[PDB]
Symmetry: C3
Subunit: 153 residues, 3 copies
């Protein structure tokens, strides 16, 4: 009954000449997210929520030589398990004015579920626009938010 909650936030700029990768899914689009990594904003938010729930700090405290964000999410899951926690569920929201993310959501859930060794019914991803407000509304970046529940076994 030693439950813990975590929350994660990430945002990346949208830039020309890079693939758009969110939740491990490559999405056709003229721009992609900027970062040292593949800049997977969704996977980063989830990673931080998981580190947060296990009180293990954040991505900056932990991170891998040219690794993509799925390898990092897998490693995050590893460190969470190492600290004696089991993951109960993940929920998240992606905020992007464009492109449409709906057709890709189930693939993202499947990717996250595989990376965390969770059944699909314990992983959720939601898609939002920013109603044309601010930098998200102008399509200058994409934000992700995440929440994670774990239990110390």
């Amino acid at each position: 009954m030693d439950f813990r909650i975590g929350q994660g936030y990430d945002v990346h700029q949208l830039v020309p000449g890079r693939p758009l990768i969110i939740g491990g899914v490559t999405i056709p689009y003229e721009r992609g997210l900027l970062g040292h990594s593949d800049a997977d904003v969704l996977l980063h938010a989830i990673t931080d929520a998981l580190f947060g729930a296990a009180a293990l700090g954040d991505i900056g405290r932990h991170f891998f030589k040219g690794a993509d964000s799925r390898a990092l999410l897998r490693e995050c899951a590893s460190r969470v398990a190492q600290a004696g926690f089991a993951i109960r569920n993940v929920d998240s929201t992606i905020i992007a004015q464009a492109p449409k993310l709906a057709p890709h959501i189930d693939a993202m859930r499947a990717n996250i579920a595989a990376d965390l060794d969770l059944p699909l019914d314990r992983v959720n991803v939601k898609a939002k626009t920013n109603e044309k407000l601010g930098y998200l509304g102008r399509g200058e970046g994409i934000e992700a938010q995440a929440a994670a529940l774990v239990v110390r076994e």
Copy 2:
């Protein structure tokens, strides 16, 4: 002990010409939220948090005013096997003052979710004059929900 958490986000533009409805409450103001129906930013965030906790997707996958949608959301969460344990939320608006209307929103939300009043919370924040929120160009809501098998 099969608990799940969910989280929700919503924002709408604040424009002259529409009524301001937040948490089912019509609030007198020179401007209102722009959306498909009543643009109830608070109920939308809560609805998303509930679907998220149940891993049922989001508002767009499932879906009338926003209270009707919240009630249908709650029905679907119940059918998926989940009981709602609590909801917490924050509205971010530079104006008007929301404090007077909080109990009314909590009452509407608790009714729609068939929850005791003490399992529903709504908080109110300004954006300290920063950004589109701080300039009164929109209103944001954030929600968290805990459910159980």
Copy 3:
């Protein structure tokens, strides 16, 4: 078995001539957060998450920004009083997680000290308190260093 979750959000402007105090830590910096109190954005977010989890409203309900008794108020004192009211309502705190978002200064060197302050104020062990530090990847007013934001989540049990 009566668990509840809460979430909190806060933002304050960054201005010259104010102490920069985040998570109870005075951080050397040429600007600080503007507010009625010491403007501790992180502690406020956590305070709101705790009040939210207990369904006790928000920091404005409990510690009004128009009340002169809270002018320059120590947000750690506010957080302890919040924790006291949450306990009085019948709740025990299980954990806190949080994020600070700031273009500058570097927060990594101060995070452990913030964690320790929050754990002290909530009478929790360090391993139930987490503070994460983020930039906004150069976007928006946060990217321009006009303010600093904090987010928090709390789990309690009645």
